């Protein structure tokens with residue numbers, strides 16, 4: 228049944244600067260070294276942590292307790308494991324003694340060499356910091372695996388002009404060996420992944436407005452579809468509800484596409500933000516979702532699928548929760564609020580979990 | 591004797607993406623909440639870690655061992671402590687019960703509110719990622735402490751155009767409350783710190799060339815001088831030896847200024863990179879120092895001071911060491927190489943230590 232393995236490298240919405248958004252994807256069970264990244268916040272450093280840290284599991288929190296029981300954050304039916312998957316690790320264990328004798332740093336370089344395609348949702352620094360700082364690793368070997376950064380134009384153009392520009396970062400895309408490449412995707416078009424037998428389908432969404440410019444700020448949702456099984460996951464960039472009359476209904480377009488083309492039984496998960504709780508201070512919420520807005524969007528999807536069973540069986544994996552100087556971990560507050568609102572909206576057997584760094588989901 | 595407390599938030603040169611360059615400065619012993627940052631890599635997240643982690647101390651390594659004895663990395667005479675200093679923590683402990691009842695996240699916000707001036711050496715992403723991602727914290731309170739980002743023009747112009755531009759990051763400098771400001775410094779000019787009774791004196795240095803543009807890439811060295819004691823520390827951005835005939839001798843200008851204006855006994859420390867070991871693969875070394883180049887620069891300073899005692903008593907704190915897929919921790923390799931070369935060059939009782947994240951130096 229399981230088709231996808233999703234490694235949560237980073238699910239932090241800020242403002243603390245580590246463990247920001249990055250998810251690694253690979254097919255379930257298989258042992259190729261190749262990996263896809265969605266976004267580019269947490270990277271090599273987090274892979275290294277996961278190698279080292281590899282029951283009554285406790286996860287970091289820093290609110291009521293510095294560590295909290297893992298089960299508090301997840302749906303009881305979620306297929307989740309701490310650390311990197313057996314199949315991901317097997318690519319290192321292909322060489323018995325070599326694996327054993329490689330130190331943690333060396334193992335980190337080896338795993339990371341396999342992360343060869345990034346799908347970037349938007350170029351805000353929290354979504355690209357690891358991609359950028361990690362990038363010189365591409366030059367460690369002459370027989371190097373080359374990396375490609377994919378995105379919609381609002382993303383790629385910004386990376387070219389503002390990041391890989393010899394000012395913010397050396398312009399590694401200008402190196403003649405082309406070991407780092409930037410490539411554009413067309414919105415709404417079924418495009419192919421480079422190694423895995425998957426389709427990638429990107430959609431533009433809204434993510435607030437410029438402070439100085441007042442210009443709409445865009446983001447991306449990615450659909451990944453396994454062609455054999457027809458199973459799909461949706462992995463989202465930062466997003467807000469479309470602004471009533473001033474903006475195109477990009478989210479409605481997205482949900483309509485999903486309901487038309489992907490039967491619910493084939494939708495194995497959606498990784499989507501809920502940055503803020505209901506108490507929502509305006510400044511932190513700009514360009515983002517709170518529980519009422521996320522539930523409203525899921526309700527729209529529900530209406531489109533048009534089943535008396537609602538969204539029964541759908542796994543919603545909540546990402547990008549922000550820190551706040553609150554008494555209680557906002558991930559717990561948000562999870563409770565989402566579950567309450569989902570019940571109130573009769574969305575059925577919807578399974579809501581918070582994305583937890585340092586874990587792999589099997590969907 | 592001790593005048594400065596230096597909190598090492600980040601001393602990692604990359605390519606792993608966490609704990610990159612950031613040092614917090616304050617006067618020794620005093621308990622004001624105000625703090626200066628030099629650079630802006632590791633920030634809130636690291637402050638939080640230091641709050642939580644607060645003998646046979648072991649520090650992270652990830653080479654021969656995942657953790658190594660602290661003493662291996664430092665000169666035996668170095669005044670160093672794990673965690674935040676008593677005086678830094680006292681600003682939180684001014685309120686007895688409030689401190690106790692504040693969770694770790696809340697304490698992090700409180701300490702971080704005091705970090706109100708950053709002195710940025712150059713705008714490479716590893717030197718600004720925490721500054722940027724942490725910046726929305728400024729909006730948590732209406733009676734907010736405002737933050738100022740200082741730098742030479744090569745730094746400030748790039749931050750304005752390429753970072754705080756509603757593309758890479760919301761342009762928080764355009765918010766009317768001006769809670770985040772960018773301010774330029776003039777090179778070679780004695781300027782005043784905002785709260786501490788210190789002079790700040792910035793100098794431009796070289797840091798390689800653009801990959802695409804071939805343009806010189808600039809960085810900054812900062813001198814901080816306590817006006818009362820006349821004691822100084824030097825805190826450096828990334829740097830390479832000046833390129834023979836193609837470039838101005840910016841480093842010679844710097845050492846000449848130091849030797850003319852700061853007696854060695856008043857020079858309490860220099861925090862300066864040695865990104866790479868002697869084995870130096872060309873690609874990783876570009877724009878940086880290796881032990882022979884760092885020792886050559888210190889030799890130039892030695893010649894200028896012109897004492898038979900060499901640089902006896904000088905604390906050299908080595909920063910920005912890069913990871914490498916080597917068998918041994920490059921910080922250990924580099925420390926050994928620097929000490930050997932210093933002896934070979936008869937630099938005297940030079941005290942060399944590696945900067946270690948999560949520690950405070952008292953100089």
Ligand SMILES: Nc1nc2c(ncn2[C@@H]2O[C@H](COP(=O)(O)O)[C@@H](O)[C@H]2O)c(=O)[nH]1
Nearest residue numbers: 240241351353438465510511513726729760
């Ligand atoms: N005060 C204020 N903060 C903003 C504004 N626009 C964006 N931000 C902040 O910029 C940050 C961008 O990162 P993101 O939230 O998209 O992950 C957000 O945390 C948000 O709080 C704004 O217009 N005013």
Ligand SMILES: Nc1nc2c(ncn2[C@@H]2O[C@H](COP(=O)(O)O)[C@@H](O)[C@H]2O)c(=O)[nH]1
Nearest residue numbers: 363366397603604714716801828873874876
């Ligand atoms: N291959 C290659 N890497 C470069 C070049 N210029 C800079 N870099 C890399 O860009 C990174 C910039 O961060 P920094 O090293 O300044 O902390 C460095 O790690 C360096 O390895 C270059 O011309 N060629």
Ligand SMILES: [Zn+2]
Nearest residue numbers: 240351353465
């Ligand atoms: Zn974000």
Ligand SMILES: [Zn+2]
Nearest residue numbers: 349351434465
């Ligand atoms: Zn964003």
Ligand SMILES: [Zn+2]
Nearest residue numbers: 603714716828
């Ligand atoms: Zn650097």
Ligand SMILES: [Zn+2]
Nearest residue numbers: 712714797828
């Ligand atoms: Zn640099």
